[PDB]
Amino acid sequence: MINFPKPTVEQFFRTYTITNFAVSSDEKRLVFNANLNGKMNLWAMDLPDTYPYLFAHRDESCNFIKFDPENRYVLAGFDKDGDENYQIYAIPNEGGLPHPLITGDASEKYYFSHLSADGKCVYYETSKENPSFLNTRIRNLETGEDRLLNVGEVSTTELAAVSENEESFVYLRAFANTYIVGFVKMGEETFNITPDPEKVHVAMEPVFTDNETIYFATDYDSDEMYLAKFDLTSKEFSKVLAFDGESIQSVKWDKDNKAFYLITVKGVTDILYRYDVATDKVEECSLPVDIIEQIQVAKSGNLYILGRSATVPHNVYQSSNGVEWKQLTNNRVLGLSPEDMVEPDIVSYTSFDGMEIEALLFKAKPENDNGYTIFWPHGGPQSAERKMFRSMFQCFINRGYTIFAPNFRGSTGYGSAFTKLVELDWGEGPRLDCIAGIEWLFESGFTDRNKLFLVGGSYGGYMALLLHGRHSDYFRAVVDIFGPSDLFTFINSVPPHWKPIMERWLGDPERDKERFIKDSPVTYLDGMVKPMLVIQGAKDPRVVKEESDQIVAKLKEKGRDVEYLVLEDEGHGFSKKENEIKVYSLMLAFLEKHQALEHHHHHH
Amino acid sequence: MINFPKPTVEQFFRTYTITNFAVSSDEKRLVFNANLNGKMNLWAMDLPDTYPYLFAHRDESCNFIKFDPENRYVLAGFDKDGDENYQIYAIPNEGGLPHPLITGDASEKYYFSHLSADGKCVYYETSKENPSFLNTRIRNLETGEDRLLNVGEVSTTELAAVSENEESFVYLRAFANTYIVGFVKMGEETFNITPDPEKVHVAMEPVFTDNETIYFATDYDSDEMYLAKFDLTSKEFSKVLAFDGESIQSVKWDKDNKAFYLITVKGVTDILYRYDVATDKVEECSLPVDIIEQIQVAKSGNLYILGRSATVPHNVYQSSNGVEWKQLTNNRVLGLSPEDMVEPDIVSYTSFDGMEIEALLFKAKPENDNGYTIFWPHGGPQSAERKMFRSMFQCFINRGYTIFAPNFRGSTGYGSAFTKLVELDWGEGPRLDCIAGIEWLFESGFTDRNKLFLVGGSYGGYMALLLHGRHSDYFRAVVDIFGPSDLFTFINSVPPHWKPIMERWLGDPERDKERFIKDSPVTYLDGMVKPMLVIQGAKDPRVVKEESDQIVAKLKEKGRDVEYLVLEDEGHGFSKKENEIKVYSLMLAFLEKHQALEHHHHHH
């Protein structure tokens, strides 16, 4: 009847992000962090009523939310403008204004570790007197007394679990993202929790089941993360449950049912399992989305997840049995449904050394298809592109782009060994996996030559710059979103507590000088001749602004076609809607103007 | 445990407004207009799910919302930055971007009147060819055809109801706010719906129950508005149902139960009644709030309202039967409950001629009380101050102010005769009502001399200016929010279609020269010695910018303490949160600094 034009990119601009949530011990309140009003703030629902209200006002990113078990307060962590100098604040149980609780100087960090079961004692890590390795302290909220509990040594040390009786403590000590050693502290004495800490492995997600037992996730002597157990009395490590070709990334003790909920990564999706300890039996549950951001188990055995799909934005869901899910939030893409968006095809190709590489290909719909492709290397590097909603992707797909995102070596979800391959090799193997995937796109016919764009953020921004420098001929245009450009400057500018990890992840500036030169994008500045858009957040602590200033500066001396957008109030990401939309709008205009006119004149 | 500071002012800044709403015919969608994300936009709930999602993006005020009966579209009307040039847009059933439907030049107005029961034909009013009186047209959505239906004559005329068979039409013609004459057009002939249209009276809210029958509210030969019926065949007018000391202001036909829902005004609250036509019986319903803003009756008989109370913000409720209400939305004040806010005491005093004047007194809480009082003349003037939420009041009360809001002569809610007393008397009767209220405050002890601020908006702002001009000694400082300052400029600057009403409401600038001067604030410019803040929206069509510009320009010539805030992107109100907050912040800081220093030195 009325002729409504088809959807435009502006419809994809009004979707918000939910980063995080928590559920009160009695399940009467669920609080979540979302930029529903244009900036990050905590919102609440009085379950079962799902109409949300503002729970606290702050307009900052939030790193954790914790209910008092006796409902006298809510704790949350907030930084400044993407600072990542998170500190700990308290909020009245009914909401209100955050109140400084465990805070200090603007450059200090205060991370929440554990809350005592009586709600009196907060365990946390701080960088204050120990920037490199962090100290572990306790604040007693009744008396105000604050104690040193553990002094970090050797590498970055955090407190990851505490026994009901507050006599036993599990620490995790990170030497790399793939080498994380667990130890228990009991007397003055300490104990490894795997059989051999000299073996490269991760221990994650420890939980006390007794004052004398922990279970946790580890890939000790395996290519996948499995469920292990450690007995503090006998000091016995045991392998309990493993999944063929899947890594456990989440362990949740359902105490009253003596059961675990376990999330695994199987490539580009997450799977949920229930494990009944007593009957040693495993139920395969069903998730309503493909990618889980967070999960919580209430005392009653109810299950709460935060997750998303390719075609479904961040939403929170509730289940009793882990099989039928009530969707609680209703975060949608304006006027559309999953059918209106594109699911990616999972696809694979063979790389230079015979290694099979899995990738996500999002084909533009014929009706929208503009003939161009965006090659998107994900950020990390020890991360992944997965069936996870980014309004960014579907926005570009709406404008008609095909998108290709390969999980180059270094990506997670393909076992421990695959993930280690980017270590000490940021610019050889992964780059060649990308070139190989580009060649595959041409062979496939889903990309035409001279119609390939290149877009990437963070590590992907570095890869965008690196591919630009050394393989310019492939690309029509490049977008670099906070990409490190020089490895010597970058490894010196990361936060101190990342420094001990950087020797194993990246390398050493003096010992590995030659590799560092060869993998730094600024070394190939002369080869960066295609039009380029650079985007950076001034407050970024991971990839500091200087990495984007220097590369833009060096290009501008050579009179190059470079655009540069700085967002004064953001860090490693865009928590404010205004800024997010500004970035989308600019990337779209940039890519549009660098398509070829290809104007056809017909018989008229 | 944790020492939380007491509620601050900034907690009243995060509350949003809901101005208007509609429910689909099948009750499976409810759409409403709100500035929950900082600007006005349509949000929606898939009932019984109440988690809302964005339905249309526009960032503009919305004057109506209308579902298609066959669920192929939603109509809505938007202006530009508080222009009040509303025009008609269509939105897909699922939501999306509004599409120009019945629109034109930026200065033109297109007001929706009626949609045909098949969803084919849209009746509307436009200023285009008849700015003073308006014309009524019809648009066929299947064909694109647009016919002229009626030409406004004599005074400003709208189509208020259309029969099921589209052969009879009720028009309303307004000569004053208290004088609105109804007539019916069938064939080419027209009849009065009241016996004598020479009697000053109002007819309102007509509804066709048959193609031969209408009911409506009117106050013909009465001091209150009552339910009335007019039979189109026999041309019989009947007085059907009246409520002692209450005026009907809304009339809703529940067709399947042959029943009426009627809302009355009884001073400072609204009351809901059900009237069963078959049995001539009245059932008194209960409301979950004191002031109703809008009401729809679904075909199933279910009841939907939007409203508020002194301590409960705008919210939407639903009922099977008008007794037990389900609150659908959760618009709250951040971290607070009703009990944390102040209910006004209902008070009354005798005025200069013995007339009784009702008033709302908000007493500051002992623990907050700063000892000052704010005197607030409401806007309109043929409006009222009522037990209605304004985040503004509770914000000032929290900071420690007592607030007094009298319903001076001209106010609604105390019968037709009372409402007319402001007509041709803006600056005398009501001015003296205010003075008597101020004298009563002093005598009651609830306000001290030298501790009285004055704050008003619209007609309230005119009154603020006048009270300042002729009576400055009563006041520490004054806030004028978009108030007319000079009656000569004002009456010439109002919108074209408001002009016909203006001779009866205000008067004639030649015939009434003397009174216009006596009642213009700007003739008492010399008496405005107290410090004053002035607030104006640039796009305001009711009280144009020039009314505030000129009074500020004149006070500045005499070196007076005047502050002026213009909001470039607002009209006669603050639809955008950023502006509303700037206004509150500035008012609070203005009133603080013009309190007396009151420093107390202690023995320490």
Side-chain angles (χ1 to χ4, degrees), chain A residues 12 15 288-291 307-315 317 327 331-333 336-344 362 365 386-391 393-394 397:
Chain A
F12 297 83
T15 297
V289 292
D290 307 325
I291 296 292
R308 63 209 224 248
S309 296
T311 56
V312 182
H314 305 80
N315 277 280
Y317 300 75
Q327 183 173 344
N331 185 18
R332 323 181 51 78
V333 176
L336 303 179
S337 305
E339 306 95 79
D340 303 301
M341 274 138 85
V342 165
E343 277 285 329
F362 295 75
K365 306 179 183 226
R386 320 183 54 203
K387 294 176 160 182
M388 63 215 303
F389 165 97
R390 14 170 102 259
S391 76
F393 272 21
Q394 298 298 323
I397 290 160

Side-chain angles (χ1 to χ4, degrees), chain A residues 8-16 35 332-334 389 391-392 394-396 399 576-578 580-589, chain B residues 54 57 97:
Chain A
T8 59
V9 297
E10 286 83 26
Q11 299 191 28
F12 297 83
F13 290 172
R14 309 308 165 181
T15 297
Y16 51 91
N35 60 354
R332 323 181 51 78
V333 176
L334 180 53
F389 165 97
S391 76
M392 193 180 306
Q394 298 298 323
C395 183
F396 290 125
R399 178 53 69 76
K576 295 176 207 65
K577 289 303 297 173
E578 270 182 48
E580 191 183 355
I581 288 166
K582 185 158 196 186
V583 171
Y584 293 171
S585 286
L586 194 73
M587 289 173 73
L588 287 163
Chain B
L54 189 70
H57 172 84
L97 293 176

Side-chain angles (χ1 to χ4, degrees), chain A residues 1-5 8 10-11 14 16 18 32 36-38 43 45-46 49-57 59 68 72-75 90-97 99 101 118-120 141-142 327-332 334-337 578, chain B residues 1-5 8 10-11 14 16 18 32 36-38 43 45-46 49-57 59 72-75 90-97 99 101 118-120 141-142 327-332 334-337 340 578:
Chain A
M1 172 159 280
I2 302 169
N3 281 351
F4 289 117
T8 59
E10 286 83 26
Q11 299 191 28
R14 309 308 165 181
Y16 51 91
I18 301 163
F32 66 105
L36 166 62
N37 67 15
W43 288 77
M45 300 161 150
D46 299 324
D49 178 25
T50 62
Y51 193 106
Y53 53 101
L54 187 68
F55 189 73
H57 174 79
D59 291 335
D68 176 21
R72 303 160 283 184
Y73 59 88
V74 175
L75 303 177
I91 299 157
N93 178 243
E94 305 185 307
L97 287 188
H99 173 58
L101 182 61
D118 69 343
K120 183 216 198 97
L141 310 175
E142 206 170 81
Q327 183 173 344
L328 304 178
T329 59
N330 226 315
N331 185 18
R332 323 181 51 78
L334 180 53
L336 303 179
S337 305
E578 270 182 48
Chain B
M1 182 143 270
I2 305 170
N3 299 140
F4 285 118
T8 61
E10 22 279 313
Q11 277 175 252
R14 313 307 168 180
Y16 54 88
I18 304 177
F32 66 98
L36 187 156
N37 68 17
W43 291 78
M45 304 164 189
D46 297 332
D49 189 357
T50 57
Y51 194 105
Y53 59 96
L54 189 70
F55 189 77
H57 172 84
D59 299 327
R72 304 160 289 185
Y73 62 85
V74 172
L75 302 178
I91 297 149
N93 185 238
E94 301 70 39
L97 293 176
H99 175 59
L101 193 63
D118 59 353
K120 192 201 198 86
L141 305 170
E142 188 173 47
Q327 177 162 0
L328 298 180
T329 56
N330 249 290
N331 186 7
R332 299 185 63 72
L334 177 65
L336 307 190
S337 276
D340 304 314
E578 252 190 29

Side-chain angles (χ1 to χ4, degrees), chain B residues 11 100 157 424 569:
Chain B
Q11 277 175 252
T157 299
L424 315 172
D569 58 341

